[PDB]
Amino acid sequence: MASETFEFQAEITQLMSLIINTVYSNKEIFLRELISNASDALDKIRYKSLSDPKQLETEPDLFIRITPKPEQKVLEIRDSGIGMTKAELINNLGTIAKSGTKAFMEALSAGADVSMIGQFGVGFYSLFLVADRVQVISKSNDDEQYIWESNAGGSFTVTLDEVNERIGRGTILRLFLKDDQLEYLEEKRIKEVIKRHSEFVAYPIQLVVTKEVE
Ligand SMILES: O=C1CCCCC/C=C/CCOC(=O)c2c(O)cc(O)c(Cl)c2C1
């Protein structure tokens, strides 16, 4: 419907502007960070299900799925984890977080690997190494499906989702890739990045491949 607009906490803006603009070389690290977050969200629904198995029924399969959408210059990273309510999207992604965000920027001013970002709990924002815009589409068992959208630029929107496929339960990160980062639409490239840095994941990592017949 109508979107609601929110202001990012200043430190999150600071972190994002730095990441979207950085000339840091090893931009592929974004995928390990998002796979790690997906795995963590799956751990949470699995754990919750130990005492409330009905929570799994909205999506009984536990998976991470990567879907390139070349025409739209989009890469989607989906999980069937715990998901986020409207309030959780606003909370987890924009208006609070803090969270080692300041400490990570300080570690950068001193020379840390950008690749250390996950150790500060803010690996999500590494997506701006390869994307200039993101939609986070999420469905918690506790709320309706919502879309959080950011272009790294100070404000974000949250909208009740009347436009995307229903996700049973979980989260899609829909990355709108930069024009010079379209290699991450390629099956060969995605496979190599996954295999090298995400070796001990307990859930299947599914790659959606679209190919012409004959
Ligand atoms: O806050 C988040 C991650 C926090 C660190 C991982 C712990 C999991 C928390 C559950 C809620 O997180 C999510 O659903 C979730 C996800 O599935 C994939 C993502 O890429 C992101 Cl950014 C999130 C949001």
UniProtKB/Swiss-Prot annotation:
Subcellular location per the Swiss-Prot or TrEMBL entry? Cytoplasm
Provide the binding site for ATP. 33, 37, 79, 84, 92, 98-100, 119-124, 171
Signals that turn on the gene: Expressed constitutively and induced by high temperatures dependent on transcription factor HSF1. According to PubMed:2674684, it is constitutively expressed at low levels, however, due to the specificity of the antibody, this result is unsure.
- General remark: Present with 444943 molecules/cell in log phase SD medium.
Physiological role: Molecular chaperone that promotes the maturation, structural maintenance and proper regulation of specific target proteins involved in cell cycle control and signal transduction. Undergoes a functional cycle that is linked to its ATPase activity. The nucleotide-free form of the dimer is found in an open conformation in which the N-termini are not dimerized and the complex is ready for client protein binding.
Quote the subunit structure annotation: Homodimer. Interacts with the co-chaperones AHA1, CDC37, CNS1, CPR6, CPR7, HCH1, SBA1, SSE1 and STI1. CNS1, CPR6, CPR7 and STI1. Interacts directly with the substrates GCN2, HAP1 and STE11.
Note on domains (UniProt): The TPR repeat-binding motif mediates interaction with TPR repeat-containing proteins like the co-chaperones AHA1, CDC37, CNS1, CPR6, CPR7, HCH1, SBA1, SSE1 and STI1. CNS1, CPR6, CPR7 and STI1.
Q: Which family does it belong to?
A: Belongs to the heat shock protein 90 family.
| Name of the molecule in the record | ATP-dependent molecular chaperone HSP82
State the organism named in the record. Saccharomyces cerevisiae (strain ATCC 204508 / S288c) (Baker's yeast)
Q: Name the gene for this chain.
A: HSP82
Note the residue range shown relative to the complete protein: 1 to 214 of 709
